[model samples]
Target: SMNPPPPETSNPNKPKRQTNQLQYLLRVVLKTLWKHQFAWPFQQPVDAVKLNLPDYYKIIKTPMDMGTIKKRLENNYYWNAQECIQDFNTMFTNCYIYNKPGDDIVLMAEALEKLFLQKINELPTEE
Candidate 1:
């Protein structure tokens, strides 16, 4: 007979092991978003001075980027999925505040935000 699938109950360290897997799953989400076309503007911190947006920092209290999030995840800065999601939100929300409503980046943020929420739905259940 073929080998049976591993039983979930058989693992004594299921919870702790699941924690490690969660990080891997979160990395998948980050990588997917990083490869997206609209991800260019979000891939790194905004160069306000070079971009000629002098007041960008004043308006956006907390600046976030895909690179920062990825580093934080690798550093275990986020203890759960929600923490990571919040940083993603901060990235988009800052764009909303700093950019005009009709700006291209705003539209990109909307699209990326939608896709992010969809991806978040695939995260493991919070038991």
Candidate 2:
């Protein structure tokens, strides 16, 4: 009976075809934050010596400028100023987390895990 149709098979290695709206939103947010090329690599350090206060406050604010784009995200209480997030990303590359990387790799991973797990339904409306 050559009439047999092949049984369905799924590829576990393949990425999922469906994603949540929030997950997509997070991806977009992260994408916006990503660097295509180095701008001020020096500024990203966790201990970056940011002297001017009023100037750096807008470091990561939105282009449209209502407020921080992050206000909508969950677990946002831990957030520091926009300048600080800019510096946090640098903390990884600028040597504090380089040699000490092994000690708290889980720290970064868990923080992100908590952030991503926030339900998209509860997300605040974008300004």
Candidate 3:
């Protein structure tokens, strides 16, 4: 056997940690709301500039604004902030997950996760 260590690697998955992609997306959307003088829910504004990730999307300079994403997510995807919040609470209990989360939460979260994935798929590309 070879006595050596493996190279570092990384990646995806929820609210805070479980579904980071979705949660970050939610933040971006919320921040988007705050961008064009849109009614914001949270107190502070997220670095919504993340949504205009030029490296991924084709339009490198001045990518689509958060308003566009908010509109697209609202109209196209069934993106619901309240639902995500509820699920975040459900997926955790006093800072812990339930024993049967995979059995139930998986299916539930997967359904909505795909909705976001679909939108994200339309956004970027690998370099």
Candidate 4:
């Protein structure tokens, strides 16, 4: 039989196939970015905000140097805030492809945060 008509290449009229591939790629990138950025905080039920109190006391129970630990904690929070803001900006500026300036970024972030928090809350806690 005639060689199967050259395995029909992507349709020339409609770039549906190409568009689909692009969409898939974008999704993969977004997922990878999210995983990398959120892995630490989403790992378990331990709230970064409150989980460290015991550790703080253990490390700096002495009143003489508690100030140093407080300063370090403050610095860590500041750095984490900066990193979070930068990641959010990048997601809004580059990850979001929709041209219309709607609430896509905010909505996506909220949904993701909710899901992450729910998962974290479900984790088994020692206390």
Give the runs in model 4 whose Cα sits over 4 Å from its true position.
Answer: 1-33, 36-102
What residue runs in model 3 are displaced by over 4 Å at the alpha carbon? 1-102, 124-127
Ranking by lDDT: 1, 3, 4, 2
How well does model 1 score by local distance difference test? 0.72
**Candidate 2: regions farther than 4 A off:** 1-23, 26-29, 32-102, 119-127
Count of clashing residue pairs in every prediction: 0, 1, 4, 0
Pairs that collide, model 3: 13-19, 14-18, 14-19, 14-20
lDDT, candidate 3, at 15: 18
Candidate 3 accuracy as TM-score? 0.22
Task: After the best TM-score superposition of candidate 1, give how far the Cα of residue 52 lies from its true spot, in angstroms.
Answer: 1.0
Residue 21 of candidate 4: its Cα lDDT?
23
Highest-scoring model, TM-score: 1
- RMSD list, candidates in order: 13.6, 19.3, 18.2, 25.3
> Cα deviation in Å at residue 122, candidate 2?
4.1
For model 4, name the residue pairs that clash. none
Residue-level lDDT of model 3, residues 1-127, one tens digit each, is: 1112211112122112324444445555334334423232112212224433232222122222233344333433323444433332332231123224555434443443444445454432322
Candidate 2 accuracy as lDDT: 0.32
TM-score of 1: 0.77
lDDT of each: 0.72, 0.32, 0.33, 0.32
- The better-scoring model by lDDT among 1 and 3 is 1
Q: Candidate 1: where is the Cα deviation over 4 Å?
A: 1-25
Rank all candidate structures by their TM-score, best first, as comma-separated numbers: 1, 3, 4, 2
* lDDT of each residue in 1-127, candidate 2, tens digit only: 0112211123345333222433444354333333222213322222213433342223422121102223323323222233323433343333332334444543543343344334332544432
